């Protein structure tokens, strides 16, 4: 696709902190750019929709390639469309919007120009930032990850995209997502089959992977952190149901994989660790500090601050490990324990050493889950599972709370805020 001006584009700024071992920290200034599929696609040269509702107009998008000929991104309105806004080293991220249609949620990828992404190189670095949970109930998740895409948007490998970072593109993760409107420079009409249980989305018949780190997917009920690797490390067009992931019928039958190597509190056996009020050590009621360090092995090590208090990841013990990071050992006890065979299929920490090498864009999203209803994350899953499964709870929320049309009539005024991004070599991150 290209790009219009009917709405000029404004990326929200947004600081952060690049630390150094040397002891100090500097102030970056960044902004957030929306992902595409959020924003209104028209003809190069009028109004008229190329897409609407969740279909594609037959004349502007007849194929793939004449489609993305003949449509471009618009500009977004990010508060009043979208209910984001930043503050400072801030960014809020709203649930439901309704203006003149329906938005629910946003993802955003951090910039470091008007046309190209941050990239960080994780291994050996640590990642440090404040949220808010208290506003985000069962069946939501706010996220921070991290995903193998390119810093441009695209633009240099599919040249057919002249929209670029500057207008979202590019998107890709580890659940090969089928549902984005462009991808590699075309549309994604070709196959295209509305959802039957969301008016605004629906799937093509391509879809876009890459290696995913989700150092954060949290409501106020549950949290996990959970790197996702692929056996190609970046990104990649799939076909169809070959994609995989959330929006295929097999989601095991792909290139990435898409469960993860999780560690969830509350799924090992920790009830009391995280939750809201005064009877959980941390409380999701107040802001909270998350810490992840990428160890040069290949693990994950984590810890929390709360009002001035620091609270290591607790110790879990799992078949024969006993620890509390993410390391070989659990993930090979969590598959012994829980099943499941993907993470190592896909080669486990070692192959996701490749991602962390390598440089990775900063997203922040709040979503709802219309394929799992965020089972997965806070309530018993999967569900033809019981309680005495082990792993099967991952947090005390009921099945139907987290169905879509349940959530956006209840909770629409839900949010998440992200603050106080710091970034540097492991240890750097306390820096004044
Ligand atoms: C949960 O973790 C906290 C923080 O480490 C600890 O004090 C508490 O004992 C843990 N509970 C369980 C069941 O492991
Ligand atoms: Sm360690």
């Not at 941050?118 to 998740?141: A, I, K, M, R």
């Not at 196959?191 to 890459?210: K, L, M």
Request: hydrophobic residues 25%; charged residues 15%; aromatic residues 10%.
């Amino acid at each position: 696709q290209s790009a219009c001006t009917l709405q000029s584009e404004t990326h929200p700024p947004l600081t952060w902190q690049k630390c150094s071992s040397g002891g100090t920290c500097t102030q970056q200034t960044g902004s957030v750019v929306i992902d595409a599929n959020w924003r209104w696609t028209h003809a190069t040269n009028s109004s008229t929709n190329c897409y609407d509702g969740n279909t594609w107009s037959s004349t502007l998008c007849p194929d793939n390639e004449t489609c993305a000929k003949n449509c471009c991104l618009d500009g977004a309105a990010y508060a009043s469309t979208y209910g984001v806004t930043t503050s400072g080293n801030s960014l809020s991220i709203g649930f439901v919007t309704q203006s003149a249609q329906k938005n629910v949620g946003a993802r955003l990828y951090l910039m470091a120009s008007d046309t190209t992404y941050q990239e960080f190189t994780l291994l050996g670095n640590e990642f440090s930032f404040d949220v808010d949970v208290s506003q985000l109930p069962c069946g939501l998740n706010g996220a921070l990850y991290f995903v193998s895409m390119d810093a441009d948007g695209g633009v240099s490998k599919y040249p057919t995209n002249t929209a670029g970072a500057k207008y979202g593109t590019g998107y890709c993760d580890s659940q090969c997502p089928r549902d984005l409107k462009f991808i590699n420079g075309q549309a994604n009409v070709e196959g295209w089959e509305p959802s039957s249980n969301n008016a605004n989305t629906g799937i093509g018949g391509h879809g876009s992977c890459c290696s995913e780190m989700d150092i954060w997917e949290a409501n106020s009920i549950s949290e996990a952190l959970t790197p996702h690797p692929c056996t190609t490390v970046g990104q990649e067009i799939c076909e169809g149901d070959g994609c995989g992931g959330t929006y295929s019928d097999n989601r095991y039958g792909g290139t990435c994989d898409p469960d993860g190597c999780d560690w969830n509190p509350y799924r090992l056996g920790n009830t009391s660790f995280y939750g809201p009020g005064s009877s959980f050590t941390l409380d999701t009621t107040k802001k909270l500090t998350v810490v992840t360090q990428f160890e040069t092995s290949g693990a994950i090590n984590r810890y929390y601050v709360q009002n001035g208090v620091t609270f290591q990841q607790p110790n879990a013990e799992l078949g024969s490990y006993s620890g509390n990071e993410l390391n070989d050992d659990y993930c090979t006890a969590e598959e012994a324990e829980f099943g499941g065979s993907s993470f190592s299929d896909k080669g486990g920490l070692t192959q996701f050493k490749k991602a962390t090498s390598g440089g990775m864009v900063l997203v922040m999203s709040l979503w709802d889950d219309y394929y799992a209803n965020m089972l997965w994350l806070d309530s018993t899953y999967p569900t033809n599972e019981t309680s005495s499964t082990p792993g099967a709870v991952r947090g005390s929320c009921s099945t139907s709370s987290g169905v879509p049309a349940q959530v956006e009539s209840q909770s629409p005024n839900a949010k998440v805020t992200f603050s106080n991004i710091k970034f540097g070599p492991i240890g750097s991150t306390g820096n004044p």
